[model samples]
Every structure is written in structure tokens, then in C-alpha cells.
Target: MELSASATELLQDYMLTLRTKLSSQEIQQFAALLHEYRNGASIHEFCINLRQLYGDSRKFLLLGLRPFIPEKDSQHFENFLETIGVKDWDRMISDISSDIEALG
Candidate 1:
């Protein structure tokens, strides 16, 4: 399904409303990239789609080290993916939490 401007704009407005509790500078920036890749990538490719999205996202996951890359949120988010694939999810978060504490 294609997510058009109408729905996406509504999302943008809503995300705007949640700034203090759940916002980052990159909220819209990330949303735009998501909209861009989602609209085009889902169209341009397939298993290749997975390749690009997974590949690009991997890099973002790797190189993203900042205030937002706090890792805890993404840590569990990845835990979802990993637990779907990583039996040691808790330990993974333990290590991740450790790194985040050091980074913090």
C-alpha cells in the first residue's frame, strides 16, 4: 500500500504535537526519508527492496551515534527483531544497556 501525502501529513501533524514527550529534531527528517524510501523503494524493487532497505538501514544503525541514537529505544526495537531472531535478547540488551551507559 502506498502512503500518500494526505495520511503522511496527518502523521507529521501528530508527531508535531508530541514534541516534548516523544520528539527529536530528526522526527520529520526521518519521516521524510521513510516516505521517500517507502514510496520509491517499495516500487523500484522487491527482494532487492529488502536488500536496499536492510542495507541502508544497517548503515544508519551502524553510523548513527548521537543524542538520538541513545540505543535504548532502538535497542529494544532491535530486540524485537532480534528476539524474532536472537534467543539471547535480554543479554543483548544487557550489553546494549552497558554500552549506552558508557556512552551516556
Candidate 2:
């Protein structure tokens, strides 16, 4: 992924705005977790971050990151919803976590 520093800053701004609206400790915890997730290269990391977003916003994020992901992996993500798919958003997050855990 060729994410520019400016892109990272913009995402941070978006997540922090979300932080302001979350009152539950769980939500805040996940939000913080997501803040970390968006900083890395793996598909899991990006998917994990997307779990924190909702409704159209999640779609918004995926669209935003499409250009930055490696072409093969980006295609994989696009096919995810069809072949075996990624399940729900939370499951997708877990899938990403699982992939990252094995990666290192």
C-alpha cells in the first residue's frame, strides 16, 4: 500500500471525530483499536479498522482505501463478498486479526 502521510492524518481525523460520539467503553475501546489498525499494511489491519465504521461510512472507507492496497489483495477484497465472503463486519475484522496474527 502506498498510503501517504496526509492520508493517515485524514483518517485519524475521521476516527477521532467518531471517538467524540462514542460513550460506551467498548465502543471507545474498539475505536482506539481501529485507530491502530489503519496504520499498517495488511488487509486484516484495514478490515479491522472498518469494523469501527457503520452504515454508508464503512463503504466510504473501503472506497477510500481501494487505490492504496496492492492490486492482488485489493481484488481479493472485492471478491470476498462472493467467494466464501467475509461474513459480517465483525467477522471480517476477526478475519483480519487472524491473518495478522499469523503474519508475524
- Most lDDT-accurate candidate: 2
Backbone collisions counted per model: 2, 1
* Model 1 lDDT, residue 17, Cα: 44
Clashes of 2: 1
lDDT of 2 by residue, 4-73 (tens): 6554455455445444554356444554444455445456654644544433334443444443345556
Q: Write the per-residue lDDT of candidate 1 for residues 1-104, one digit (tens) a residue.
A: 89455433443344344343223534334334434433443312222322233353342332222232224344543444343332233443344334334433
Candidates' C-alpha lDDT? 0.36, 0.46
lDDT of 1 at 41: 36
TM-score of each: 0.23, 0.32
Candidate 2, 16: how far from true, in Å? 13
